Ligand binder design. Structure first.
Ligand SMILES: Nc1nc2c(ncn2[C@@H]2O[C@H](COP(=O)(O)OP(=O)(O)OP(=O)(O)O)[C@@H](O)[C@H]2O)c(=O)[nH]1
Ligand SMILES: [Mg+2]
Length: 167
């Protein structure tokens, strides 16, 4: 009765894939990392009374040239696509990533959500809320903005991808 989830987090370099994950897992914010290394965390959380066993695959940076597999993994229960509100490139890239992710997964019922991270960097935003939101809507995906400095926003990200898979 203790549910299980493997979640993959995707996106361009330095968008905050690791920071969000670490903030959600260890409750702290970090200034540096090992960019091209894949990392996997385990985290237990109770969402609405139900206990979930979480595996979080913090993938290495990908761009428009990264190879996406042609076939999905059964054991992966959902995908978080991250970009930074401070980087146009990361936004262009997350669209390419969604594209290649959709080729890989086909019609299979595995949730994909979109996260615009670094919302706390007000003076460096180059992507509006409406643009991320409308992109997500065009994908029939969920959308949140987040800051890896703000624990509750990282919580809301993972909670939402879990809830999508229950839908
Ligand atoms: N202010 C602010 N800085 C952030 C936020 N998220 C990440 N950063 C910073 O952005 C830089 C990149 O963060 P990472 O978590 O390493 O990004 P990443 O997606 O894991 O990048 P790769 O591992 O290279 O793929 C780091 O210096 C972080 O401290 C955020 O939400 N707000
Ligand atoms: Mg990473």
């Amino acid at each position: 009765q203790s549910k299980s989830r493997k979640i993959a987090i995707l996106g361009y370099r330095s968008v905050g894939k690791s920071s969000l994950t670490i903030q959600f897992v260890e409750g702290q914010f970090v200034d540096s990392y090992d960019p091209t290394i894949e990392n996997t965390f385990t985290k237990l959380i109770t969402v609405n009374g139900q206990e979930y066993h979480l595996q979080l695959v913090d993938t290495a940076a990908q761009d428009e040239y990264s190879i996406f597999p042609q076939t999905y993994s059964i054991d992966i229960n959902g995908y978080i696509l991250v970009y930074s509100v401070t980087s146009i490139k990361s936004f262009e890239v997350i669209k390419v990533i969604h594209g290649k992710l959709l080729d890989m997964v086909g019609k299979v019922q595995i949730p994909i959500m979109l996260v615009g991270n670094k919302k706390d960097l007000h003076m460096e935003r180059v992507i509006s809320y409406e643009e991320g939101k409308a992109l997500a809507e065009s994908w029939n995906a969920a959308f949140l903005e987040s800051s890896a400095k703000e624990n509750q926003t990282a919580v809301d990200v993972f909670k939402r991808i879990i809830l999508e898979a229950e839908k």
